[PDB]
Amino acid sequence: VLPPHTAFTATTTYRAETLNAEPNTAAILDRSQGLASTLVGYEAARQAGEVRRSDPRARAEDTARGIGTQTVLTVPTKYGELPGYQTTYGAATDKMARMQADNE
Amino acid sequence: MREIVHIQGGQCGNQIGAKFWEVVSDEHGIDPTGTYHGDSDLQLERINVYFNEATGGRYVPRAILMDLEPGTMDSVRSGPYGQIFRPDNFVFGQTGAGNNWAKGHYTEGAELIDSVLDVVRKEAESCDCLQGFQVCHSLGGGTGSGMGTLLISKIREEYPDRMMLTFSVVPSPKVSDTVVEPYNATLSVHQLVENADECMVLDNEALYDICFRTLKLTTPTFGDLNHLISAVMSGITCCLRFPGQLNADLRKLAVNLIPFPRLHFFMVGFTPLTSRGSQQYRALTVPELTQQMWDAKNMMCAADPRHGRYLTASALFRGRMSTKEVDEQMLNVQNKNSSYFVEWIPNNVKSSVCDIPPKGLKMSATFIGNSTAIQEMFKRVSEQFTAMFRRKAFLHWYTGEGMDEMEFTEAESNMNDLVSEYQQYQ
Amino acid sequence: MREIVHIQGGQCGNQIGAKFWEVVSDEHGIDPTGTYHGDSDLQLERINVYFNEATGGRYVPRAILMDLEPGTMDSVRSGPYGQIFRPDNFVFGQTGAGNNWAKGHYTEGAELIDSVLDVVRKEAESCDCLQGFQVCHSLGGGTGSGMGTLLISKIREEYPDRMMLTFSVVPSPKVSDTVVEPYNATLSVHQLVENADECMVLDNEALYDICFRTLKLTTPTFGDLNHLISAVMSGITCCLRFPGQLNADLRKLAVNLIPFPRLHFFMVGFTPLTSRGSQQYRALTVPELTQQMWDAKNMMCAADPRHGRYLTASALFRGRMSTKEVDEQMLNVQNKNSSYFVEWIPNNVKSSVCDIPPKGLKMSATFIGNSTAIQEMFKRVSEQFTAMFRRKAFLHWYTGEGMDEMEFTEAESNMNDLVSEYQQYQ
Amino acid sequence: REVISIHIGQAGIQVGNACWELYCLEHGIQPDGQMPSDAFNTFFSETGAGKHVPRCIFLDLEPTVVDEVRTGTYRQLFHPEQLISGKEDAANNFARGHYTIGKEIVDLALDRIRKLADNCTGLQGFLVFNAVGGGTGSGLGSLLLERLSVDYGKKSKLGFTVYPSPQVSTAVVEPYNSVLSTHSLLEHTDVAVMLDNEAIYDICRRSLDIERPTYTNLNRLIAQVISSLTASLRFDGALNVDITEFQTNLVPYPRIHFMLSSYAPIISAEKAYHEQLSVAEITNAAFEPASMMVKCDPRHGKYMACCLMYRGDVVPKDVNASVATIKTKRTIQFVDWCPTGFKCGINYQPPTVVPGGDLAKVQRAVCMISNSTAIGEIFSRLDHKFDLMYAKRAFVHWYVGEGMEEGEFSEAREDLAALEKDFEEVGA
Amino acid sequence: REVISIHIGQAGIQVGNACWELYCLEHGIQPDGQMPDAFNTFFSETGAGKHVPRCIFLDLEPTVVDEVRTGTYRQLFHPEQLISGKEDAANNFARGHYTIGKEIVDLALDRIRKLADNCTGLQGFLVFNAVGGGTGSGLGSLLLERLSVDYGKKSKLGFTVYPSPQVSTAVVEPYNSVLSTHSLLEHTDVAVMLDNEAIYDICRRSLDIERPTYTNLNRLIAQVISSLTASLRFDGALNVDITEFQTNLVPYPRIHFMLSSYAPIISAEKAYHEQLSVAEITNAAFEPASMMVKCDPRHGKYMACCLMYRGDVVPKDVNASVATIKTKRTIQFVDWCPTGFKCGINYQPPTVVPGGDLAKVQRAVCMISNSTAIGEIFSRLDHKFDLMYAKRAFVHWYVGEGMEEGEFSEAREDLAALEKDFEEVGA
Amino acid sequence: DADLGKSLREGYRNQPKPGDEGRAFGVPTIRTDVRLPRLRSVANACNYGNEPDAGQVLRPPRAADLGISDEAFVALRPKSELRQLVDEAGLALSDADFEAAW
Ligand SMILES: Nc1nc2c(ncn2[C@@H]2O[C@H](COP(=O)(O)OP(=O)(O)OP(=O)(O)O)[C@@H](O)[C@H]2O)c(=O)[nH]1
Ligand SMILES: Nc1nc2c(ncn2[C@@H]2O[C@H](COP(=O)(O)OP(=O)(O)OP(=O)(O)O)[C@@H](O)[C@H]2O)c(=O)[nH]1
Ligand SMILES: Nc1nc2c(ncn2[C@@H]2O[C@H](COP(=O)(O)OP(=O)(O)O)[C@@H](O)[C@H]2O)c(=O)[nH]1
Ligand SMILES: Nc1nc2c(ncn2[C@@H]2O[C@H](COP(=O)(O)OP(=O)(O)O)[C@@H](O)[C@H]2O)c(=O)[nH]1
Ligand SMILES: [Mg+2]
Ligand SMILES: [Mg+2]
Incomplete structure (x- = not known):
């Protein structure tokens, strides 16, 4: 027997990227928005960031910290950070991140 | 605009063409009733290359079957996408060649080839500007090889300025159907070196090898092999039917691949090929395609390309x-394994990009490599031919019908000098 | 960036690799179905060193499992984290070596090594900046030692500029699992000394003694032993996978631990290893880790290092x-017990700190000591080898396959000159 | 002041599809073709009322990309009679494109361009867009250039040609095609501008760091370059130079017209946010080989004459200062015969953005167009790989069966040798 | 007036992470990059409300650099200057000088080119490197060589991290140290040694932190650097530029190795304890219990000293305190130089860092002197180097990379000649 | 795939900051929007805001010798300030015409 069905949806390059530039830029850049540079390469990270995107104090603190917990969705969370994971760079910049969050 | 007419010869050609027209009709979105049922408008734009509308959206393939035994006809009619064809194009004998190339080129041709030439003419002038002709056939059978190669000669006599593709499966001693396979294949290619523009060399041995290693199927029936070659032929003409960032029609594919007029024997491979278990554990990138393209376990000929250049x-x-x-x-693949490529030609790889993948897939590729490794196959057949010709076994069924000995000797001569020029350019 | 591809040979190599990829998967927070579900994205930034993304976050280990008996593969696919390997990477023979180095190096290698070389090559150029290879195998068995040995030679012949770890388990008389242990072990290291960059020697006796005294566990199955060795291997590669205050890569540790090209055998210890009942009563400081590191009853070899330097x-x-x-x-452990160290090299200790502990621990440490006490082990092997070679017992099984006598003599010679230069630098 | 644009080839019309999008976005014209509420007069003629049609002809042999254009959103900009489409493609065959199908298509092309020029009034010149590697843009491009030279002759023809890169290539017979194209590109066009593809790949890898660039970003940046070149006609500047100025100030000898292009700053959004943008560093950035449109090393070459278009907020003071700094530096070296080797020009309007583009809105931009001997190097690099294949008579039979001979092959080879000799002489 | 700073190696950029943190906190620049003329010497005013620094971090392993790329200072440094290789040199001077340098130094210097063309009144460069590692030493030296052939006449202040005598983390760092000095000698203009054991002792003794990490070390090191550039950055009663170090501290072209020291290293509570005035801090900047290099300056004679003062300081008392120093006999000067002091007074007091262990003080002193105690240090390095080279240990790594015994012997004898020169000048 | 047309990474992304959708990312040559320096240094190669053109400096207003900078005229002043100025100088105009001119 024949395969059930397969819808045809792939558009051509011309239509795709030199006629729908305004929607295309939006979609592409909204896939990879919250993720940091070294983290945005992997696709599971983009999916995690999307489910995450879908407290303003916590949000400002996040976007200040940068790499602390973009892909979060055992280990319970403290008010400031996670128990097991504390890098020396973050330990050095805790106060600057806090001041930045307060100013934001 | 550019036009391709299709001709199928012999049982293998018919069943191959059957799966081929099922695939193409699926690609362009026409159901086996012949009506249009596609959704995207990209499908309509280039269906004149393969179809003619008859009455009120009834789309029919620009195809011509040709054989001598009605079993194949009932076989192609029984399956789905079987009643979409042209009942008048079912041009067809009644006696049957019986794997005798002399019968396929002298006896039944004298009363069937006028008729096929009549219908292929009608189909040719029905369209405005031909691009080329496309013939699918074997090289072992009688009604496929003999009738096919005479049809090629007559057509090249009629239309010389048109392109020509021929997909011919060649026999192997490991996968050997008949005993007269060298008797047929030798004379067949002897006509192909002078008549056809270019060919795509296929064989069933490499296809079974693929279904063993990369596909890991248990029962590779003929429909599976035929489904493979159909995807290959869909790929080779995806450039005409769909726009790309870099287009490569049949003619410039030919002018890029053929440096000398006698050197027109190609091997072909397809990607991606994954088992349903390993289908989840693979990536889809250009390097993922290339590492599988240039693998020697993916060529659909029985010629290891690392045995030549x-x-x-x-x-x-x-x-x-x-x-x-x-x-x-x-560039990286050409510079890494620089030994397997020829020296006196820079940038040996012509590439092209189409913006339409096969249905349901994300990205695919088709490799057509004109190597010198095919001379092993021609020696593989020529030595068997001389072994049988040394004491004229099975010769008399050819002699008593009208064929003489010098045809065989001229075929061997052409075999010897084509492998000689292959070895020369190696 | 820097890439580590994995190789597993033989039954022990497979089971060790299984536990290894279990703990690494748990370390990076990926589920046994292959999807990330961890907490800190510090896990994400360096999963490329051990994984490749297939389709929608399907991270598969960049590993190659290889042996000759399917029961090991079944035991691999049985347990969890067994459905995350790419089934193409299960390159695998069918006949079986059976504790014969000649079978694993001349007979079965002739038809398995080109296949594994195909797979490892594709796995090598799949990534961009190779750091090195990581091997887990044995020296007593046949299909692990011999096949892996020849594989190491081929790889070092193809890629001379990449690093190489070898975790090899050696036997002991007290725990003598097979009979031809010296016949295989001698030849294996005789090849390792010219091929491998460095070797991390292991054994089961030290593991049993560790679970005796420190762990106080009742029934130490192989799983816990492989769990310890796995914790060792995660520790040795922690520098690449996580940021720290002083990072020491693989080549960095090799250049700090290898003063002479033939002196590249290490002994390993892991801390902290404490019983559960006594886990509550202890503090967790650096001196607490130091007292357990420098304990001679904590090395993973049967060479008490205070018998040497x-x-x-x-x-x-x-x-x-x-x-x-x-x-x-x-500085303190180096100043007090100053006779235990070599004199003509000041500051004999290279240290490194990483900020992320293994899961469930506050503070851990991995020790790698290049000491001359290992010559006691090699002499402990060579005397058994000479005792057998004097009588030529069990030798016909080797000479009746293609091996000759001079290979054994050169193994004796390289064994003797190695222990001679070790004794020299002592 | 009017100028028309012809696109000959698969590559030419993609460059044009980029360019005309850019032009409409610059002039505020919706894709329907009207201005919602005079400068446009150099590209758009106003038919009747409320319409603006380009002064352009796309022409091609295979109809696929042309009717893709026809079916796109720009149906209303070009109505269907200027877009010339043949029936079958020349298929990477210079002979087939110059003799077989050119003979049927060039007459239509030329008697359409005649009425275009007649509708025009003060025609400055023509500008052609082609890639010499293909078949159409090679053969019929040369045929069209020859017929335009015999029809007009005294009008300047700007040929923005795309050459094959040394190591990166998509065809096989493009050496043959390029040799046969250049044989007539030497003596027909007035000002020829080279663009390779590997240089733009390197640019988009380094500065814009798009690791997987398609052809469209290349074409967008080429359109930006063309827009910067023609802004002098389109908008009034503090120091304006027209198309006759390249003819005059850039061509020291009637056979030496091959110009290397460079554009700056090719910069992203936050990279511009990062970088303090001024004139001195962009005049610098216009000169290193990591920002040229041609894969060549001008350190080995000596400049003959350079031209610098500036667009945006640029005063003459700092551009004079930067040119003085450049002339005093010794890392690059101008030719001795020309004392004063610079030609500046300044324009008030900044380069615009294109949505879906990769560049942000920038205060100021520089387009450098220079003459050197890296081009004579490039031509010998091409000649070598042409001769390599010609020594074995490879692929010669296709051209011969089309109907050409060995004579034109040998004469184009010796013409390229003559050009090499010319360049090694002028570099003295 | 501008000065740019390059950071080589894993140590140098950690120093940069504390250094630039202190600069932005000093000029009131938030990590996002904008203030809510003194900044001109370190930050270029890009765009509108934005300042980017004049530095290049460079390293072969990307782990520490991309940690900076994704930390809190993502928007301050835009990652175009943060140069990063693909793989480490792995404590191998030869690997970091010939194999990997030949691909990274060019990219570094054609980035530093257009940085220098951006600047206008460039004073000089200042380098941060650790000579114990592989990357900092190998391509660090290589970069300094190509810097010298590019500009030459411009000043270069090298702040190096030498290995400690007994406290050490590496093994082959003697080899890398000696191979660094052979080029550090004739390429740097003004070299400041800083060691780790001395700073460990300072933080243990004065700061009473029983368990310090590299962070505290890098924090007070940044305090030293900022204090020695504060003259350029802010107006003072008597300020001195970068060129004065070369003039007032470099007697001869091959004697440029300066001891550094800082006072007062005082925590928050000890500031409540003690009264901080100029006399006691001028004294405290001379004890070996407050030096940045573990060596005994009593064993040597001080050829020339430099005192940077920050805060509430009048020329009267600083001249009175230096008078007492000149008349004290516990520390002896060299007979040839009669006037061996170079003072400098700046008004702005040093700043604090939240989370830093130092308290704010009225006034602070950064002493930079030149002695022969360094002549003791290099001989101490020379001894343990020959101890290893006598047995040809670890040499196969270097020659396998492609080097030979030639530069080994010539760098060994170069330190020997430097030893004889210091012994001769101590006269 | 995602990284097809755009750079997609955080340090090189083409997406502008949501604070300002449109602004030319560069240094204007006139520096019209910067806090005025308290005291302009002796060596000042850059200009801030309103400086009189040559057409004006070649032929100055009469209050240019007294020390009134030309920006003092163009600076905005409130109503009480203007009233005090016209009362301090001997203009002596009525409040009606004052309000009219105002
Ligand atoms: N810059 C740029 N070059 C292109 C583009 N598309 C194709 N090319 C170049 O064009 C060359 C081949 O000629 P094409 O333009 O593809 O086709 P053609 O010139 O019309 O010749 P035919 O294929 O015979 O029709 C290739 O070497 C490409 O480098 C493009 O979109 N941008
Ligand atoms: N004072 C101080 N020294 C440091 C710091 N970090 C690393 N170091 C020194 O750096 C030396 C080792 O070199 P690294 O900085 O780790 O790396 P490297 O110099 O680039 O050499 P490679 O390891 O080969 O890359 C050690 O001797 C440390 O003393 C730090 O934060 N402060
Ligand atoms: N791929 C493929 N090959 C076929 C099929 N049927 C026959 N062949 C090949 O055809 C060859 C024999 O040709 P034959 O059937 O006698 O051709 P005919 O008698 O002229 O129609 C054999 O070598 C087969 O490999 C098919 O369904 N698929
Ligand atoms: N730690 C550990 N050691 C093992 C395991 N299986 C086998 N070994 C060791 O491996 C040696 C025998 O290896 P063998 O199975 O014969 O290797 P092979 O036959 O070549 O695959 C014995 O001395 C065992 O101590 C295991 O699961 N864990
Ligand atoms: Mg084309
Ligand atoms: Mg380092």
């Missing part, structure tokens, strides 16, 4: 891909 | 810690 090679790509990535990949 | 040593720390405390602890 590549003269030219082509990579047709389907899907929205990075051209820079395509180019650096082809 | 440490040439060089390295400590890999994980956890937030004071670098001052780290160094003064190293």
